């Protein structure tokens, strides 16, 4: 439960599991029943957001990147 625990994405229960096995070490969110999967490559994550202790809503947010080919 260190780099892989029970995490949520799009309101469905899940199992986050960091995938550090490839050149980009990523964060694999795997639904608890397995319905929805979401892999977050920490390589692109600019900064992490954690609902601090003051944020009783314990929600962490993963700040990403704006790559030259993605800019809006």
């Amino acid at each position: 439960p260190s780099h892989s625990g029970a995490a949520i994405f799009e309101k469905v229960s899940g199992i986050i599991a960091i995938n550090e096995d490839v050149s980009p070490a990523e964060l694999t969110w795997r639904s608890t029943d397995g319905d929805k999967v979401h892999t977050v490559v920490l390589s692109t994550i600019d900064k992490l957001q954690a609902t601090p202790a003051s944020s009783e809503k314990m929600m962490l947010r993963l700040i990403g990147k704006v790559d030259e080919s993605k800019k809006r």
Partner: protein
């Protein structure tokens, strides 16, 4: 809003002497004002 509430948690690693006359006057005025208030 969302960044204001939910704090970014990260590990960003990282390894003469005389002012102008305008400041002179500003300091004199601020000195007066401050004195009066005190």
């Amino acid at each position: 809003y969302d960044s204001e509430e939910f704090e970014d948690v990260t590990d960003g690693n990282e390894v003469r002497n005389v002012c102008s006359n305008e400041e002179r006057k500003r300091r004199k005025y601020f000195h007066m004002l401050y004195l009066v208030c005190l």
